[PDB]
Design an enzyme around this catalytic site. Structure first.
Site, PDB file in Angstrom:
ATOM      1  N   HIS A 104     -35.698  41.282  38.571  1.00 41.82           N
ATOM      2  CA  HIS A 104     -34.264  40.777  38.449  1.00 41.82           C
ATOM      3  C   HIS A 104     -33.446  40.827  39.897  1.00 41.82           C
ATOM      4  O   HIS A 104     -32.603  40.231  40.208  1.00 41.82           O
ATOM      5  CB  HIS A 104     -33.437  41.881  37.955  1.00 41.82           C
ATOM      6  CG  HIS A 104     -34.084  42.172  36.745  1.00 41.82           C
ATOM      7  ND1 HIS A 104     -34.948  42.812  35.871  1.00 41.82           N
ATOM      8  CD2 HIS A 104     -34.506  41.484  34.997  1.00 41.82           C
ATOM      9  CE1 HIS A 104     -34.562  42.951  34.587  1.00 41.82           C
ATOM     10  NE2 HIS A 104     -34.787  42.025  33.967  1.00 41.82           N
TER      11      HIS A 104
ATOM     12  N   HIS B 155     -29.364  47.216  46.447  1.00 41.12           N
ATOM     13  CA  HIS B 155     -29.839  46.156  46.213  1.00 41.12           C
ATOM     14  C   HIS B 155     -29.371  44.629  46.549  1.00 41.12           C
ATOM     15  O   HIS B 155     -27.669  44.749  47.194  1.00 41.12           O
ATOM     16  CB  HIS B 155     -30.141  45.755  44.739  1.00 41.12           C
ATOM     17  CG  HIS B 155     -29.626  46.005  43.734  1.00 41.12           C
ATOM     18  ND1 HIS B 155     -29.175  47.296  43.240  1.00 41.12           N
ATOM     19  CD2 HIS B 155     -28.489  45.555  43.129  1.00 41.12           C
ATOM     20  CE1 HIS B 155     -27.741  47.175  42.871  1.00 41.12           C
ATOM     21  NE2 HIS B 155     -27.791  45.883  42.590  1.00 41.12           N
TER      22      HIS B 155
ATOM     23  N   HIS C 293     -27.757  40.558  45.329  1.00 41.34           N
ATOM     24  CA  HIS C 293     -28.061  39.260  44.194  1.00 41.34           C
ATOM     25  C   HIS C 293     -27.536  37.929  45.655  1.00 41.34           C
ATOM     26  O   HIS C 293     -26.632  38.345  45.948  1.00 41.34           O
ATOM     27  CB  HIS C 293     -26.637  39.784  43.386  1.00 41.34           C
ATOM     28  CG  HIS C 293     -26.611  40.945  43.138  1.00 41.34           C
ATOM     29  ND1 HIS C 293     -26.874  41.310  41.284  1.00 41.34           N
ATOM     30  CD2 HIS C 293     -25.859  42.087  43.027  1.00 41.34           C
ATOM     31  CE1 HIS C 293     -27.502  41.932  41.023  1.00 41.34           C
ATOM     32  NE2 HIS C 293     -26.292  42.958  41.627  1.00 41.34           N
TER      33      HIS C 293
ATOM     34  N   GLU D 188     -21.341  38.389  43.353  1.00 45.72           N
ATOM     35  CA  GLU D 188     -21.192  38.653  41.800  1.00 45.72           C
ATOM     36  C   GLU D 188     -19.429  38.812  41.682  1.00 45.72           C
ATOM     37  O   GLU D 188     -18.740  37.555  41.024  1.00 45.72           O
ATOM     38  CB  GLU D 188     -21.578  40.183  41.355  1.00 45.72           C
ATOM     39  CG  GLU D 188     -23.111  40.505  41.219  1.00 45.72           C
ATOM     40  CD  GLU D 188     -23.641  40.836  40.347  1.00 45.72           C
ATOM     41  OE1 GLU D 188     -23.793  41.952  40.669  1.00 45.72           O
ATOM     42  OE2 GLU D 188     -24.212  40.017  39.801  1.00 45.72           O
TER      43      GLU D 188
ATOM     44  N   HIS E 202     -25.876  46.114  47.220  1.00 43.18           N
ATOM     45  CA  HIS E 202     -24.763  47.391  46.112  1.00 43.18           C
ATOM     46  C   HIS E 202     -25.704  48.608  46.443  1.00 43.18           C
ATOM     47  O   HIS E 202     -25.945  49.224  46.365  1.00 43.18           O
ATOM     48  CB  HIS E 202     -25.242  46.833  44.707  1.00 43.18           C
ATOM     49  CG  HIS E 202     -24.007  45.296  43.992  1.00 43.18           C
ATOM     50  ND1 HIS E 202     -24.216  44.591  42.843  1.00 43.18           N
ATOM     51  CD2 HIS E 202     -22.886  45.271  44.833  1.00 43.18           C
ATOM     52  CE1 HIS E 202     -23.399  44.381  43.061  1.00 43.18           C
ATOM     53  NE2 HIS E 202     -22.414  43.509  43.841  1.00 43.18           N
TER      54      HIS E 202
ATOM     55  N   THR F 193     -23.847  44.890  36.675  1.00 45.73           N
ATOM     56  CA  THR F 193     -23.447  43.697  36.654  1.00 45.73           C
ATOM     57  C   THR F 193     -24.379  43.051  36.056  1.00 45.73           C
ATOM     58  O   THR F 193     -24.737  42.526  35.387  1.00 45.73           O
ATOM     59  CB  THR F 193     -22.875  43.015  38.201  1.00 45.73           C
ATOM     60  OG1 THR F 193     -24.166  43.508  38.528  1.00 45.73           O
ATOM     61  CG2 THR F 193     -21.762  43.204  38.517  1.00 45.73           C
TER      62      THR F 193
HETATM   63  N1  LIG Z   1     -25.238  45.592  39.878  1.00 44.24           N
HETATM   64  S1  LIG Z   1     -25.012  46.974  39.802  1.00 44.24           S
HETATM   65  O1  LIG Z   1     -23.823  47.655  38.652  1.00 44.24           O
HETATM   66  O2  LIG Z   1     -25.085  47.596  41.109  1.00 44.24           O
HETATM   67  C1  LIG Z   1     -26.272  47.853  38.794  1.00 44.24           C
HETATM   68  C2  LIG Z   1     -26.611  48.988  39.348  1.00 44.24           C
HETATM   69  C3  LIG Z   1     -27.616  50.103  38.654  1.00 44.24           C
HETATM   70  C4  LIG Z   1     -28.770  49.051  37.787  1.00 44.24           C
HETATM   71  C5  LIG Z   1     -29.454  50.012  37.175  1.00 44.24           C
HETATM   72  C6  LIG Z   1     -28.852  50.641  35.610  1.00 44.24           C
HETATM   73  N2  LIG Z   1     -29.867  51.059  35.354  1.00 44.24           N
HETATM   74  C7  LIG Z   1     -30.551  51.790  34.295  1.00 44.24           C
HETATM   75  O3  LIG Z   1     -29.664  52.302  33.277  1.00 44.24           O
HETATM   76  C8  LIG Z   1     -31.921  52.189  33.551  1.00 44.24           C
HETATM   77  C9  LIG Z   1     -32.186  54.291  33.622  1.00 44.24           C
HETATM   78  C10 LIG Z   1     -32.004  54.998  32.664  1.00 44.24           C
HETATM   79  C11 LIG Z   1     -31.910  56.168  33.077  1.00 44.24           C
HETATM   80  C12 LIG Z   1     -32.119  56.482  33.833  1.00 44.24           C
HETATM   81  O4  LIG Z   1     -32.589  57.885  34.104  1.00 44.24           O
HETATM   82  C13 LIG Z   1     -32.719  56.107  35.174  1.00 44.24           C
HETATM   83 CL1  LIG Z   1     -33.317  56.462  36.476  1.00 44.24          CL
HETATM   84  C14 LIG Z   1     -32.814  54.278  34.969  1.00 44.24           C
HETATM   85  C15 LIG Z   1     -28.219  48.188  36.766  1.00 44.24           C
HETATM   86  C16 LIG Z   1     -26.874  47.039  37.504  1.00 44.24           C
HETATM   87 ZN   LIG Z   2     -25.649  44.711  41.737  1.00 42.33          ZN
END
Ligand SMILES: NS(=O)(=O)c1ccc(CCNC(=O)Cc2ccc(O)c(Cl)c2)cc1
Ligand SMILES: [Zn+2]
Length: 257
Positions: free
Chosen positions: A61, A91, A93, A103, A116, A195
């Site tokens: 992604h 990371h 976008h 975004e 981000h 997002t």
């Molecule tokens: N574009 S953005 O808004 O900055 C953004 C930022 C981060 C994420 C990653 C979210 N991941 C999870 O939810 C999976 C997880 C689930 C349980 C876990 O212990 C761990 Cl490490 C990971 C997505 C979008």
């Molecule tokens: Zn992001």
């Protein structure tokens, strides 16, 4: 599963993730003339001196530069935040063209990309628990425009060849994220969500006013990555951004006039 194509893109996410049409979804358009200056906001404090980067991963992604968050080595505090938020990863976008990619938008203007820096509230013990809280995460967003090169980003650009496809990762130690910040820390803040799926509404967004400049050659290398895994038909990793969502019952606060 979910993606950024015509058949699995943002318009389709609500079927598997109903929260996509929620009360506080991100990103949003930042109307600079509607945001309210908040004199109560404390100064923003970015403490990245002891940051410990570990690895860079292409997750299909985007690509994540991961940090060691077992201790308060790199934290974000102040501003609208209560307590301490530890940096876990950062990371980007970006788009297929320089005129799109970010975004969040500013007065409907789209930037070439958006950085981000993701942090989690230490009061919750771990990232997984934090995403289930309304004030679990704090994401620092930085806009990228095309112009002169950003020296501090080159090290990231040069390693992308080693993680071209989904699932690939490479050692990425001793990287200093302070090299990706603009001069000013002026910002806008509002309560939002992740997002990308699971789109959890656990984020306090802090979006910096001043964008950083990167060269055309640097962003071009971002666009050479693949959404696909090795041995599969090539799908260039571009336009991996969600468009602006309704602001609804929310207020965007500004740290400056
Ligand atoms: N574009 S953005 O808004 O900055 C953004 C930022 C981060 C994420 C990653 C979210 N991941 C999870 O939810 C999976 C997880 C689930 C349980 C876990 O212990 C761990 Cl490490 C990971 C997505 C979008
Ligand atoms: Zn992001």
């Amino acid at each position: 599963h979910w993606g950024y194509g015509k058949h699995n893109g943002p318009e389709h996410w609500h079927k598997d993730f109903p929260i996509a049409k929620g009360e506080r979804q991100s990103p949003v358009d930042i109307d600079t003339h509607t945001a309210k200056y908040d004199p109560s906001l404390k100064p923003l404090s970015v403490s990245y001196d002891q940051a410990t980067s570990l690895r860079i991963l292409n997750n299909g992604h985007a690509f994540n530069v991961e940090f060691d968050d077992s201790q308060d080595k790199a934290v974000l505090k102040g501003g609208p935040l209560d307590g301490t938020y530890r940096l876990i990863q950062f990371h980007f976008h970006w788009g297929s063209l320089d005129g799109q990619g970010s975004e969040h938008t500013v007065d409907k203007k789209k930037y070439a990309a958006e950085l981000h820096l993701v942090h989690w509230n230490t009061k919750y013990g771990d990232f997984g628990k934090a995403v289930q809280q309304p004030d679990g995460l704090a994401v620092l967003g930085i806009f990228l425009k095309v112009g002169s090169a950003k020296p501090g980003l080159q090290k990231v650009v040069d390693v992308l060849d080693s993680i071209k496809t989904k699932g690939k990762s490479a050692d990425f130690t001793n990287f200093d994220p302070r090299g990706l910040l603009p001069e000013s820390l002026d910002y806008w803040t509002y309560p939002g969500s992740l997002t990308t799926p699971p789109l959890l509404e656990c984020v306090t967004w802090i979006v910096l006013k001043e964008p950083i400049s990167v060269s055309s050659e640097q962003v071009l290398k971002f666009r050479k990555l693949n959404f696909n895994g090795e041995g599969e038909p090539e799908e260039l990793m571009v336009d991996n951004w969600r468009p602006a969502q309704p602001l609804k019952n929310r207020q965007i606060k500004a740290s400056f006039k």
